[PDB]
Design an enzyme around this catalytic site. Structure first.
Site, mmCIF file in Angstrom:
data_model
loop_
_atom_site.group_PDB
_atom_site.id
_atom_site.type_symbol
_atom_site.label_atom_id
_atom_site.label_comp_id
_atom_site.label_asym_id
_atom_site.label_seq_id
_atom_site.Cartn_x
_atom_site.Cartn_y
_atom_site.Cartn_z
ATOM 1 C CB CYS B 46 -0.758 0.468 0.917
ATOM 2 S SG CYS B 46 -1.937 1.664 1.096
ATOM 3 C CB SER B 48 0.544 3.819 4.351
ATOM 4 O OG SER B 48 -1.100 4.946 3.854
ATOM 5 C CG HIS B 51 3.160 8.009 3.085
ATOM 6 N ND1 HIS B 51 3.138 7.964 1.817
ATOM 7 C CD2 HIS B 51 1.080 7.629 2.433
ATOM 8 C CE1 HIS B 51 1.715 8.667 1.135
ATOM 9 N NE2 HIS B 51 1.492 8.307 1.583
ATOM 10 C CG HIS B 67 -1.068 -1.042 6.755
ATOM 11 N ND1 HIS B 67 0.004 -0.566 5.841
ATOM 12 C CD2 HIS B 67 -2.331 -1.001 6.245
ATOM 13 C CE1 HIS B 67 -0.165 0.210 4.817
ATOM 14 N NE2 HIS B 67 -1.292 -0.068 5.277
ATOM 15 C CB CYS B 174 -5.284 -1.537 4.163
ATOM 16 S SG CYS B 174 -5.315 0.451 4.255
HETATM 17 N N1 LIG Z 1 -7.224 7.766 4.937
HETATM 18 C C1 LIG Z 1 -7.128 6.021 4.975
HETATM 19 O O1 LIG Z 1 -7.566 4.976 6.516
HETATM 20 C C2 LIG Z 1 -6.304 4.960 4.606
HETATM 21 C C3 LIG Z 1 -5.764 3.327 4.274
HETATM 22 C C4 LIG Z 1 -5.429 3.709 2.750
HETATM 23 C C5 LIG Z 1 -4.451 4.257 2.080
HETATM 24 N N2 LIG Z 1 -4.667 5.662 2.792
HETATM 25 C C6 LIG Z 1 -3.553 6.556 1.950
HETATM 26 O O2 LIG Z 1 -4.960 6.850 0.469
HETATM 27 C C7 LIG Z 1 -3.679 7.106 -0.628
HETATM 28 C C8 LIG Z 1 -3.671 6.196 -1.520
HETATM 29 O O3 LIG Z 1 -2.736 5.139 -1.670
HETATM 30 P P1 LIG Z 1 -2.740 3.811 -2.732
HETATM 31 O O4 LIG Z 1 -2.146 3.669 -2.474
HETATM 32 O O5 LIG Z 1 -4.076 4.118 -3.618
HETATM 33 O O6 LIG Z 1 -1.614 4.839 -3.416
HETATM 34 P P2 LIG Z 1 -0.749 5.384 -5.097
HETATM 35 O O7 LIG Z 1 0.308 5.530 -5.023
HETATM 36 O O8 LIG Z 1 -1.331 3.461 -5.423
HETATM 37 O O9 LIG Z 1 -2.377 5.995 -5.776
HETATM 38 C C9 LIG Z 1 -1.636 6.925 -5.419
HETATM 39 C C10 LIG Z 1 -2.702 7.741 -7.457
HETATM 40 O O10 LIG Z 1 -2.211 9.253 -7.064
HETATM 41 C C11 LIG Z 1 -1.897 9.943 -8.212
HETATM 42 N N3 LIG Z 1 -1.128 10.426 -8.068
HETATM 43 C C12 LIG Z 1 -0.487 11.323 -7.464
HETATM 44 N N4 LIG Z 1 0.113 12.621 -7.624
HETATM 45 C C13 LIG Z 1 -0.812 13.058 -8.284
HETATM 46 C C14 LIG Z 1 -0.760 14.536 -8.465
HETATM 47 N N5 LIG Z 1 -0.048 15.690 -8.517
HETATM 48 N N6 LIG Z 1 -2.522 14.597 -9.428
HETATM 49 C C15 LIG Z 1 -2.834 13.821 -9.573
HETATM 50 N N7 LIG Z 1 -3.349 12.278 -9.330
HETATM 51 C C16 LIG Z 1 -1.627 11.619 -8.332
HETATM 52 C C17 LIG Z 1 -0.527 8.520 -8.873
HETATM 53 O O11 LIG Z 1 -1.160 8.349 -9.977
HETATM 54 C C18 LIG Z 1 -1.360 7.103 -8.366
HETATM 55 O O12 LIG Z 1 -2.892 6.583 -8.957
HETATM 56 C C19 LIG Z 1 -2.350 7.163 0.174
HETATM 57 O O13 LIG Z 1 -1.616 8.480 0.782
HETATM 58 C C20 LIG Z 1 -2.079 5.639 1.024
HETATM 59 O O14 LIG Z 1 -1.398 6.505 2.095
HETATM 60 C C21 LIG Z 1 -5.161 6.150 4.017
#
Ligand SMILES: NC(=O)c1ccc[n+]([C@@H]2O[C@H](COP(=O)([O-])OP(=O)(O)OC[C@H]3O[C@@H](n4cnc5c(N)ncnc54)[C@H](O)[C@@H]3O)[C@@H](O)[C@H]2O)c1
Ligand SMILES: NC(=O)c1ccc[n+]([C@@H]2O[C@H](COP(=O)([O-])OP(=O)(O)OC[C@H]3O[C@@H](n4cnc5c(N)ncnc54)[C@H](O)[C@@H]3O)[C@@H](O)[C@H]2O)c1
Lengths: 374, 374
Positions: B46, B48, B51, B67, B174
């Protein structure tokens, strides 16, 4: 009669920022199609009217301010179907065209015909109905109630009960409805909740009434003016805190008092720092914070998005989320049924000509709402 | 066989920020009371986790990250009643103690025993079950799934259907649940609405599935990586926009395309600028914007509060707003009933040992979800 004629009357003009209102003789044009000219009976002095003076709220000057009022229809333009000459009306600073995508949405109330997002200070047709010494004077939020007569669009007026006391129900045109609806329609305060209300002016005390009406178990009023506490307690607050008594930031105090945060908080001041504080003091997982206060023009706040990620909801609303035209008349009916009280908000009543003394009262912290009578 | 004893196994240790994971031998202590030792079967990569490596997300190092996973209970500590050796389980990065003020709240899910708010990187009793090179190694959100075995508190584990395909339902731990829940439980997306989803990674694609499940009529996916569009379309996006193709800022494109703004907007990336753009592109009077992305630690965004005052609602949530232990078992059951698809999220399936390549796939935009198998 005055129907069809230019009316010459007194109005409070604000020629320039940070000056007293100037009571001038103004000419009020007759209403064009879909406009209503109203004879003002009573108008409340709201902090938003002061924001225009202070330059906080930017809207074309010179201007006739005032938006919290109640009067009698004097004459109507062509095509007007919703009110008649003689009707008691409340001018609506949030219009309700009844047609746009918002008016058709069950929840929204920020009608796309508003003059709020980017104030023009004109009628819907882009013109003013007011001239003073030959110079056109701008309207304010389509209402301009600091005048003996004003002209409003039909979409910005609601007909109310012929027996309503106009010097009380003028608060339904803004202060009360905003506050009350903020707690009951916007936040949707729950029974047994703990609420924190930042700012105890007229809009804040109305938020308190709304919280008490929705059954909040605990309502903490927060103000730096301790003389507002007794009235706050009178309308429902359970305790009042003054941030200046503590050595700790008030979000910490509130969090400790409420055991991890209140259910619902309301910012009813208009400061960027208290908006973030009010958000912060709500419980991180399920707290809701509602912005009601109007902040300085073009100023951004700074906040850590982690406050929201944990589960907080942050929302704002204009006019307590009420669809204006549909709700004003019901709120009046409700007031006429003693469902809520407006007297506790009225500290002072003054003849219109003493508008500036009414603003010094507000500014000095001595009043809640001053009602100006004509 | 390993019950009551220390297991020596391989785990991916992050010794310091911005370095590749080190695959090496670790010692996993047996469970203490109310603890469960799990044999991992599959874990997803993921953003995160990434991160943690980048320093965006702060938690004590050195650490065993991971996780989003599924495994089988190898053994249980004294007092454990909800799972038994051999059960299929999903470790929960958001616990469900079932007892604090949030667990009791109808809406909240951010259990007061989380290790999310101020990461300690330990078990609930303050100690670690992992030793590597003779040193204690920190846990990660009470999960630490990048290891052949891990130990979790009972409150951080849900028992799932014995027939579930662990190589697919680890996403329920997640990414899927977060995206899906952000749409259906947090935003509460309505039939016929218009939605915009910023970020089309694993989590964003899950948000698009929740939007489609809620009955959205229009789901606009936004990503700067146009290779993600085909997949977004396949799981429900009606249209995809790449902000780099346009000469105006995307909120303006989005506002125009949606005739005044979308109903629901989701920030599923973790950028401060897109959080504000997402909020902005929602209809000013009744739009709802949900933050799902995790921003860089301790950085504040700047926004104009007028964005909220017209009527917008801004929310965030962890794990799609799902009460974790109640919800996971049921989501797996929904999956088993083909109520949603997980397959489209899985682009790559690699042996655990290639975790760094799995991170490279993510980092370069070639993968959606990579599942590591043990
Ligand atoms: N709130 C929560 O409980 C929770 C749980 C899961 C993940 N998260 C967070 O959710 C986000 C997404 O996770 P993921 O695994 O899908 O990530 P990922 O990196 O797979 O997806 C991010 C997407 O954003 C796009 N992107 C990046 N920069 C961009 C920009 N400037 N403009 C437009 N699009 C852009 C990327 O190209 C990618 O397709 C992360 O920040 C992750 O930490 C939060
Ligand atoms: N959202 C809307 O639709 C809407 C409608 C009406 C008014 N408003 C706004 O609501 C706010 C309240 O209006 P009002 O007429 O009730 O104002 P008011 O001035 O009567 O009340 C403000 C109260 O805030 C308290 N206060 C000021 N600064 C403080 C600080 N730093 N800390 C703690 N307390 C502080 C004052 O002491 C006072 O009691 C204004 O910003 C006004 O423009 C917005």
């Amino acid at each position: 009669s005055t129907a069809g004629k230019v009316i010459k009357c007194k109005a409070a003009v604000l020629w320039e920022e940070k000056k007293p209102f100037s009571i001038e003789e103004v000419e009020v044009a007759p209403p064009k199609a879909h406009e209503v000219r109203i004879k003002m009976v009573a108008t409340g002095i709201c902090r938003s009217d002061d924001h225009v003076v202070s330059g906080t709220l930017v809207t074309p000057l010179p201007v006739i301010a005032g938006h919290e009022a109640a009067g009698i229809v004097e004459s109507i333009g062509e095509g007007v179907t919703t009110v008649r000459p003689g009707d008691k009306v409340i001018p609506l600073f949030t219009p309700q065209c009844g047609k746009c995508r918002v008016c058709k949405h069950p929840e929204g109330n920020f009608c796309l015909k508003n003059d709020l997002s980017m104030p023009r200070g004109t009628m819907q047709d882009g013109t003013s109905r007011f001239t003073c010494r030959g110079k056109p004077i701008h309207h304010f939020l389509g209402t301009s109630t600091f005048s003996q007569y004003t002209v409003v669009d039909e979409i910005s007026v609601a007909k109310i009960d012929a027996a309503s006391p106009l010097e009380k129900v003028c608060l339904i045109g803004c202060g009360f409805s905003t506050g009350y609806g903020s707690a009951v329609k916007v936040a949707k305060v729950t029974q047994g909740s703990t609420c924190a209300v930042f700012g105890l002016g007229g809009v804040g005390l109305s938020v308190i009434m709304g919280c008490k009406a929705a059954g909040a178990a605990r309502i903490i009023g927060v103000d730096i003016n301790k003389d507002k506490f007794a009235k706050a307690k009178e309308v429902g607050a359970t305790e009042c805190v003054n941030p200046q008594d503590y050595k700790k930031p008030i979000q910490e105090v509130l969090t400790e008092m409420s055991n991890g945060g209140v259910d619902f908080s309301f910012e009813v001041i208009g400061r960027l720092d208290t908006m973030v504080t009010a958000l912060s003091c709500c419980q991180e997982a399920y707290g809701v914070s509602v912005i009601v206060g109007v902040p300085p023009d073009s100023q951004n706040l700074s906040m850590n998005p982690m406050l929201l990620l944990s589960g907080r909801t942050w929302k704002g609303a204009i006019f307590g989320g009420f669809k204006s035209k549909d709700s004003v008349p019901k709120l009046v009916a409700d007031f006429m049924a003693k469902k809520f009280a407006l007297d506790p908000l009225i500290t002072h009543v003054l003849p219109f000509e003493k508008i500036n003394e009414g603003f010094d009262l507000l500014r000095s912290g001595e009043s809640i709402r001053t009602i100006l009578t004509f």
